[PDB]
Amino acid sequence: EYKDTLNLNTTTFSMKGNLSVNEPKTYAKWQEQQAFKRMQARKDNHGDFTLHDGPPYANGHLHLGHALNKILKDIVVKREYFKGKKIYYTPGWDCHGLPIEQQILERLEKEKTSLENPTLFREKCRDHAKKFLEIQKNEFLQLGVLGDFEDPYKTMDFKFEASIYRALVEVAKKGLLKERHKPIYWSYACESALAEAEVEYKMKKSPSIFVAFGLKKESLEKLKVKKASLVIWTTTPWTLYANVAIALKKDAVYALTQKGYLVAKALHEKLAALGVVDNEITHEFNSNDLEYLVATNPLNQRDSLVALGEHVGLEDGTGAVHTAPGHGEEDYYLGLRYNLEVLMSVDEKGCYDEGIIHNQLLDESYLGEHVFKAQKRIIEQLGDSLLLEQEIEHSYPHCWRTHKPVIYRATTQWFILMDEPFIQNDGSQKTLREVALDAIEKVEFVPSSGKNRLKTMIENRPDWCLSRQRKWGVPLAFFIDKRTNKPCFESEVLEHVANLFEKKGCDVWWEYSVKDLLPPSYQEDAKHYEKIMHILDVWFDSGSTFKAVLEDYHGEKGQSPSDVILEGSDQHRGWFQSSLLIGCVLNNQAPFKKVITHGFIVDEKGEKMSKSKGNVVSLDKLLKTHGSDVVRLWVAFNDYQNDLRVSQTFFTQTEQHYKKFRNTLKFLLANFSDMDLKNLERPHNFSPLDHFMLETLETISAGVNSAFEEHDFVKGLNILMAFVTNELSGIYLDACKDSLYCDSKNNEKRQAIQMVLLATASKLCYFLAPILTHTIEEVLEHSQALRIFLQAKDVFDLKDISVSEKLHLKEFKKPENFEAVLALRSAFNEELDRLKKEGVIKNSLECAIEVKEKALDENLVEELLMVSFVGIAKEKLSETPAFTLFKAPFYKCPRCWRFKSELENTPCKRCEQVLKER
């Protein structure tokens, strides 16, 4: 055996990643050495790139969805860094979010206690946010992400609270912040108002009842019938107490049945089929003639006005709608239109209050009962007026914080108005809805489809309720002047308070007297002013991050508008929309130029992960099992715009891809490890195969770069993997192994191969660096030749190199064309496959080929087909229109194993010379 006379060609870079052990060391080093600050300080930075982090709640450990999000951000930011830009990426945390306060409250309830002191409760919430911000920060670093994690933004910083308040001041001074009284979403479970982003729709069972309201004697006399009762359909028996009207569709036909029921003619057939009313119609009336008749509520005997409603539908129900201004927004406006009572005797806890007694709306026995709990008894009380009871399922609004169903209560709250013209920064006049719709058209969405989701919501959304009733957050800190009963928006007052918040934070709103909160010049008038104590919607706070982070730091944490924001596609309903709206108030544009979205992490079945469902995979477990580089590759190598399913099969597949990349890098490093570095300084005579590989490398590099530019990491990785698998491994490394292992170290053709391998490794490192950063750091650590060739101490010194310049290639060189020779290779491999099956030969190297097409380069044919001889021999094995195959007319060389030896067990001519080398 001559095995030990070959070139060793080994590298210290290991085939095994040992990721669990090695990655923590890399990430710990990047922290100690301040790699992100070093990236920002890079002297040759050219151009700038800002990614503005949307703030996760400072509560709980990270889940897989957080890791997906931060990994994608990291790939995007690293790509821009390696392109040569100065990067701005300050991660941040939402410290005032409802989860923080809900968690504290649940703990106190679990501990059989409560905390009623505002300053101390706020302190406990801050302490909780501090704890989980640190935990999450360290968990994010364990993913190998780089950003300003040592100087994150935090909504609970006093400066940040002031920035939020100053954003609210801008809204107020532009005339868009106004008090309104109307029914809105009300969470009884947390005694607070809420808006759309705080609601989760869930299917819920409900009573579904048809109720007769008999017309009064005098109305029957006017209509000229003996009996008539309008039938209403409702899923909310709990609001029947607050009925003031029955609304009909204008200019529509109502049918009166033989038994005396009055319903829309258009719905009679359906209603009679349900058994709600009898089948025989006796009279038809126009709704215009029914308006101003009066009926009797069967629940409490009160009058109910027959009214005409705008757009009463005839698709469901009966065409007659029980109208309760206190509990329905459309109902409210109809009530006001007819100057009717707004009956609302349900308290902040969702219970009937003394109003039902005072106004005789409902029996005293209901006092203190929760509206949903009373419904069964209410339905029983309806007696013969209940024509049909069903149970249905419908999509119903739930308070996301408490998971409980919401109700609606007429209440006075603060709103940002959507359809109120305001003065634009350019002097024109537009509503916030108009500005937001204009703004969206100037934003790039990835996927494109995301634009339509947000646009539709902005087209449809109502005024935004800002005021909340809770124990933690930023106060809506304005004074009401008791002399005018209106808010004080005087600049000197607002700036005074904002300044106090900047220095001391918002605890002063609770602790200071009105006098102390006012400027010196108002203190005489302190007695006239009373604090608003409502808390701001935290969706407003987070929608203000652009102002608090990008604008208020004047560019030091990135530009406003940001270049990119990147979050879950559920943020169209959340942070994207709130940030859009606040940006449109302040700047009349979006505070972002581009939105990239990802889907959710789900189980192998595609279902969402829940503790209850038992299908939760912890991030900790995933990372320990596979390592961060594998998890990162799994993100990048998949369709992250849609849901990503966690299963063993998919992780196994990603592991196989990681292995192929790592094994290829190892082979390259091993095979240029012995090259004298003096080769870097000179041109080489490259072979046709060398040139084909370099030209291929250039073509695929352009393709990967294009795919990565459009955030299509799957497309780019498939290009890279095909190049690695097919042209590089399949063709180039197979052809070059004989030279690499068996040629003299002095051999010029070998040195030229090494230079190609060096260029190839260089491009692999550049394109993989955003994704497998730890692994490429490790590559460079193990390869002095790569560090010198790339002029890089470490991964942060990588740049997109010009292989042409680095290899001294000639500008006019005509590209190779390997179509003919590759077609011959394919045909030969097909033939060889068949012969192997027949047991005729075991290896291509056992063969000689005589090619019919004499145009082809014979050295190249030998390399690509891996035969031992090109030309005619004696023992024919097979023939085709293209070529004849024969047994090679030589012995197997004991050293290189090619059939090129004239004598048995004797080194071939090449090998003899290398063995004798002095």
Residues that bind Zn ion (CB under 5 A): 893, 895-896, 908, 911
Enclosing H/E stretch for 472 = none
Residue 21 token pair: 């052990």
> What DSSP state is assigned to residue 546?
I
Q: How far is the CB of 655 from Zn ion (least distance, A)?
A: 38
Q: How far is the CB of 912 from Zn ion (least distance, A)?
A: 8
Q: How far is the CB of 746 from Zn ion (least distance, A)?
A: 17
CA 710, CA 698: separation in Å to the nearest integer?
19
Helices vs. strands in the chain: H and E counts, helices first: 33, 36
Scored b (16 or more CB within 10 A) or e, 206-245 reads bbbbbbbbbbeeebbeebebeebbbbbbbbbbbbbbbbbb
Q: How far is the CB of 829 from Zn ion (least distance, A)?
A: 23
The answer to whether 249 and 320 have CB atoms below 8 angstroms apart is: no
Q: How far is the CB of 895 from Zn ion (least distance, A)?
A: 4
Q: Name the pairing type of β-strands 261-264 and 253-257.
A: antiparallel
CA 696, CA 683: separation in Å to the nearest integer?
20
Q: How far is the CB of 896 from Zn ion (least distance, A)?
A: 3
Q: How far is the CB of 915 from Zn ion (least distance, A)?
A: 9
Q: How far is the CB of 21 from Zn ion (least distance, A)?
A: 42
| Torsion angles phi and psi, residue 706, rounded to 5 | -60, -45
CA 668, CA 662: separation in Å to the nearest integer?
10
Q: How far is the CB of 738 from Zn ion (least distance, A)?
A: 8
CA 704, CA 597: separation in Å to the nearest integer?
21
CA 386, CA 779: separation in Å to the nearest integer?
78
Scored b (16 or more CB within 10 A) or e, 136-162 reads bbebbbbbbbbbbbeebbbbbbbbbbb
Q: How far is the CB of 622 from Zn ion (least distance, A)?
A: 49
Q: How far is the CB of 736 from Zn ion (least distance, A)?
A: 16
711 Ramachandran zone, left/alpha/beta (phi>0; psi -120 to 50):
left
CA 613, CA 607: separation in Å to the nearest integer?
9
| Torsion angles phi and psi, residue 201, rounded to 5 | -85, 135
Q: How far is the CB of 760 from Zn ion (least distance, A)?
A: 26
CA 141, CA 705: separation in Å to the nearest integer?
27
* Nearer to Zn ion (CB atom), residue 821 or residue 893: 893
Alpha-carbon 568 to chain mean position = 2
Q: How far is the CB of 88 from Zn ion (least distance, A)?
A: 59
Three-state DSSP string of 547-584: HHHHHCCCCECECCCECEEEEEHHHHCCHHHHHHHHHH
* Nearer to Zn ion (CB atom), residue 107 or residue 909: 909
CA 34, CA 38: separation in Å to the nearest integer?
6
3-state secondary structure at position 680: helix
* Nearer to Zn ion (CB atom), residue 7 or residue 236: 7
* Nearer to Zn ion (CB atom), residue 389 or residue 738: 738
* Nearer to Zn ion (CB atom), residue 517 or residue 908: 908
What pairs with residue 467 in β-bridges?
536
Count the alpha carbons within 13 Å of 62 in the hemisphere toward its beta carbon.
26
Breaks in the chain (C to N over 2.5 Å), named by the residue before each, are none
